[PDB]
Design a protein around this ligand. Structure first.
Ligand SMILES: [Cu+2]
Ligand SMILES: [Cu+2]
Ligand SMILES: [Cu+2]
Ligand SMILES: [Cu+2]
Ligand SMILES: [Cu+2]
Ligand SMILES: [Cu+2]
Ligand code: NA
Ligand code: NA
Ligand code: NA
Ligand code: NA
Ligand code: NA
Ligand code: NA
Ligand SMILES: [Zn+2]
Ligand SMILES: [Zn+2]
Ligand SMILES: [Zn+2]
Ligand SMILES: [Zn+2]
Ligand SMILES: [Zn+2]
Ligand SMILES: [Zn+2]
Ligand SMILES: [Zn+2]
Ligand SMILES: [Zn+2]
Ligand SMILES: [Zn+2]
Lengths: 303, 303, 303
């Protein structure tokens, strides 16, 4: 295991591949092209701590993907990793894992086609053995599938953001990945509209640069806890969730939740009102994880 | 961290502030005054183990607070801690955390006003940085907000109690709080009506003095797992939950659950029937935690 | 603790009791006889790793029990353990734990009667102090109670299997049981119909011999995470759950879930469609546990 890690260290030594933009375009009323990369990219996960992350597109978690319910995805993965194969598993899709979530070799590309027939906030991740290693090293993200008939509370929502929770462990350390507590637990935000922040899973960015909102607004968060290993007790300080849709399916409706339990890979659409000006921490209420980085901020102003 | 803990030890050495009763009174059809303390109080959490707890009112978890849906709370915190600032975060309320959940200095008081517009079983806790430290040291509790229109099963309920789950760690040890397994996991009960028990989070009291009920009764428990860190798999041995309302919101109705998953800070209203005389253990079904203290007893008699 | 374990080692040394079939028969429209054993049986939980398991009937998890909603169970436990008392707790039943879930001494039998009035997928386990020790050593299983009025989606289901998740720790090590990470986390399958596999909780069997299905089929899994200690993030790779019934109660209906959060002892009925030929991994998405064994396979063929 650690001999392989020593070999990995030599092969990825000095490798820092600049982020490559996600490419997407609609090619039919129910067909969409998506082109992503697997690449090796240095990310500062805490001040003074660089993690040479295994990523989609040089982000960890990876870039946001948004499609409509009923879209068939024509997906291409370009593997830029000089030595490790990589793959893609979208939780949104119906696919044959052994035919459609297969490995793409270093310096090669693979193309796969599958439908997204279910609305919600789905995890995506690399599906290459050991899957734990590929996820823990940074190969995770979110795909949102917009419901054909929306959510019953759509008209009430004033502003929206995407938040993702993930853990970071000791660098490419399989023993730690399997047996150790996370070194950091973090939130990131991925842009839905021009001007939205787009950040990586780190301990600081969403504290230094809070998400922004106005007094009185109803805020929707599309959220997913990608793990790899921990569950999340999602809570926004100073408010209560008016409405919650588990995994973002409109049918899984809950009301007036203080805290939303998310399994590893679990998602939700949560909506809440901010009644007063100020800064509202966003946490996992498992406070050991909050202490290890998992606190984002929402700054609410009159204007 | 441990130099600060050594300084903390010196400052709280010999400090054992006797419990001070919660003070509450209604001042209008939708307005209620609540007066609490932050204080340092020795609690026996296991036989032979004294924890010099950071508390509200000399109890850990703190005293029960009950209000009605739609009540505005006029809250005062009197900080009796000679050296550490403290604050209050009620999960029931809509408030500006940076204006309304702010620190109160040693030997000072602070007053804050906010509405409780949502029914349920909410965690409250100290919101002072590091929040993990303040919660782990004992600054947690429950506020119940009674629904305007009750619960659909109100008429079926024969008896009710409040139960709270919490963990205890190595004394004021931030490394342990962040990285270690809990030393003890415990239940406590807080009084709803005269004659109800009112206990602290310890490994023994609810075993030695079980909650009481009669054969055939439908029992309601208002429950919250305050953590700080663990989730709870709440189960009453020998019965099944007839009805469950997640976070105590009447809309989040489940039926016939064997076990209720609670996130850290998660609450519920659970209802079950005890059909035969005997003693019924109440557990988290995460049995490592049950073994470390988290078993309460319900003694059911013909009379 | 470890002196008792040393004494236990001597007493169970060389003991390997061959599996004994479950015995069940219906004795009335709403009355069923069930006869089980407690016995000590060597199980290979990972290649080269024998665990001298404490079991019901020489299986760990124990044999599947299926009854109808409203059945009263006349249950007999025959304790074959030469030295340790054992008992039975069925989560399906209403019973007095202190009268009905009581210990049966070595080489004795006990008979208990109680109703199963609630539909669902319930854990059963030994209830002998320390309960953690008896569960961790292998005394867990599932009882299914079939709903009187079925599930609304019954007509859509093409094939069904039972899956159970459990952990294994260091052998009969109470310190590890309470404080340590699981050494292995595993799935097993228990037969519902002739020809179904029936396996023990190990890291390999459901990989080497996948569950079988046909292209296009809707599959139902009756699932329970028996722990003892961990929660489960249940996910089938390459599909989405069309319908989920929490604890197998028809009322607790969710739709379009990617992943189902199960507490320790938590169950569910989950249904999903497999659209393409291939092999579909079944995991807990807490990937440290998946890496430590918790991956089963579903092989889907045209025929
Ligand atoms: Cu990969
Ligand atoms: Cu909180
Ligand atoms: Cu405090
Ligand atoms: Cu149990
Ligand atoms: Cu036993
Ligand atoms: Cu996955
Ligand atoms: Na953990
Ligand atoms: Na900066
Ligand atoms: Na733990
Ligand atoms: Na006493
Ligand atoms: Na664990
Ligand atoms: Na074999
Ligand atoms: Zn196309
Ligand atoms: Zn195409
Ligand atoms: Zn608005
Ligand atoms: Zn007033
Ligand atoms: Zn006032
Ligand atoms: Zn009654
Ligand atoms: Zn009979
Ligand atoms: Zn009989
Ligand atoms: Zn079909």
């Amino acid at each position: 295991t650690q001999q392989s890690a020593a070999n990995m260290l030599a092969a990825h030594k000095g490798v820092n591949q600049a982020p490559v933009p996600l490419k997407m375009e609609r090619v039919g009323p129910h067909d969409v092209h998506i082109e992503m990369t697997a690449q090796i990219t240095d990310i500062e996960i805490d001040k003074g701590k660089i993690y040479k992350a295994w990523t989609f597109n040089g982000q960890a978690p990876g870039p946001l993907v948004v499609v409509n319910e009923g879209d068939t995805i024509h997906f291409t993965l370009k593997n830029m990793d000089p030595v490790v194969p990589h793959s893609m598993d979208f939780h949104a899709v119906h696919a044959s894992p052994s035919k459609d979530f297969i490995d793409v070799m270093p310096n090669k590309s693979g193309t796969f086609t599958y439908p997204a027939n279910k609305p919600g906030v789905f995890m995506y991740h690399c599906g290459t053995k050991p899957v734990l290693q590929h996820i823990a090293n940074g190969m995770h993200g979110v795909i949102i599938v917009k419901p054909k008939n929306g959510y019953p509370t759509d008209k009430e929502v004033d502003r929206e953001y995407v938040l993702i929770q993930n853990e970071w462990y000791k660098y490419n350390d399989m023993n730690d990945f399997q047996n150790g507590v996370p070194s950091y637990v973090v939130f990131s935000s991925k842009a839905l509209k021009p001007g939205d922040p787009n950040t990586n899973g780190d301990t600081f960015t969403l504290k230094e640069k809070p998400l922004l909102a106005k007094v009185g607004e109803k805020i929707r968060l599309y959220i997913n806890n990608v793990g790899p290993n921990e569950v999340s007790s999602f809570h926004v300080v100073g408010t209560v969730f008016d409405d919650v849709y588990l995994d973002g399916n409109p049918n899984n409706h809950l009301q007036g939740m203080q805290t939303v339990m998310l399994p590893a890979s679990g998602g939700a659409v949560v909506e809440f009102t901010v009644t007063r000006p100020g800064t509202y921490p966003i946490v996992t209420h498992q406070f050991n994880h909050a202490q290890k980085g998992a606190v984002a901020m929402l700054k609410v102003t009159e204007t």
